[PDB]
């Protein structure tokens, strides 16, 4: 769970959110077992983005091969408890936009945030990712967790490799698709890296 100072820091960082501004949300993993969450306000650029270790390792391994490409080893060092803490601190009656609402609706309801409203933009699968390449080009540095090769079924037979799905870059490219250009205000993380990850190994003296 979060320490006391960390909970305060999280609640304070989150108060940077405009409670009435357009806000995207996207998650990777099952709603009962999410592993990556992003909440992003395009008009000011602010985003909340963090990770979570899965409880069902065998579903995680299928999901990793087939949407997000995250290695279970890279999640060992993430801070626990962030998912329920962030969701509890979201402004009351916030209205969030998403591409495909069914899973996020279950996650929010499971956390007793039925007051949060979802707008499902529900773009066609290809249209939603029109700017995928451009968004990864410009913003790949914002998330390094997607290291595995990802393959997905083709609706007409067989499988194909796709770019891994990242909850943060999905928000960014969905906004780009809505406005018709990758011209968005610069995205800026609201959460400190030390809140997202536990203290890692010391730097190596070179
Ligand atoms: Mn996604
Ligand atoms: Zn990511």
Say how many Å lie between the CA of residue 76 and the centre of ligand 1: 21
d(CA 130, CA 170): 11
Q: Give the number of the ligand closest to the Cα of residue 36.
A: 2
Say how many Å lie between the CA of residue 27 and the centre of ligand 1: 6
Domains of the chain by residue range = 1-199
CB 185 within 8 A of CB 21: no
Experimental method: X-ray
What backbone torsions phi and psi does residue 105 show, to the nearest 5 degrees? -60, -45
Which residue from 119, 122, 112, 143 is spatially nearest to 23, judged by alpha carbons?
119
Q: Give the number of the ligand closest to the Cα of residue 166.
A: 2
Say how many Å lie between the CA of residue 168 and the centre of ligand 2: 6
d(CA 47, CA 181): 19
Helices (H), the chain: 4-14, 57-63, 82-89, 102-110, 125-128, 132-139, 167-179, 193-196
Give the full edge-to-edge strand order of the sheet including 24-28.
Answer: 117-120, 95-98, 24-28, 36-40, 46-51, 188-189
Dihedral sign for Cα atoms in the order 149, 140, 165, 200: positive
């Amino acid at each position: 769970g979060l320490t006391y100072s960390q909970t305060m820091e999280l609640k304070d960082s989150m108060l940077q959110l405009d409670p009435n501004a357009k806000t995207w949300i996207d998650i990777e993993g099952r709603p009962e077992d999410p592993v990556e969450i992003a909440i992003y306000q395009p008009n000011n650029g602010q985003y909340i983005h963090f990770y979570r270790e899965p409880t069902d390792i065998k579903q995680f391994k299928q999901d990793s091969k087939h949407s997000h490409g995250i290695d279970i080893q890279d999640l060992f060092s993430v801070q626990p408890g962030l998912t329920s803490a962030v969701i509890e601190s979201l402004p009351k009656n916030m209205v969030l936009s998403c591409q495909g609402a069914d899973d996020i609706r279950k996650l929010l309801d499971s956390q007793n945030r039925r007051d949060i409203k979802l707008i499902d933009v529900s773009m066609q699968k290809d249209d939603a990712r029109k700017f995928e390449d451009k968004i990864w080009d410009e913003y790949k540095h914002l998330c390094r967790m997607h290291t595995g090769i990802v393959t997905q079924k083709k609706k007409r037979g067989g499988k194909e490799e796709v770019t891994p799905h990242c909850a943060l870059l999905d928000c960014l490219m969905f906004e780009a698709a809505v406005i018709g250009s990758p011209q968005i205000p610069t995205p800026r993380p609201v959460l400190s890296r030390d809140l997202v990850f536990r203290t890692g190994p010391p730097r190596v003296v070179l």
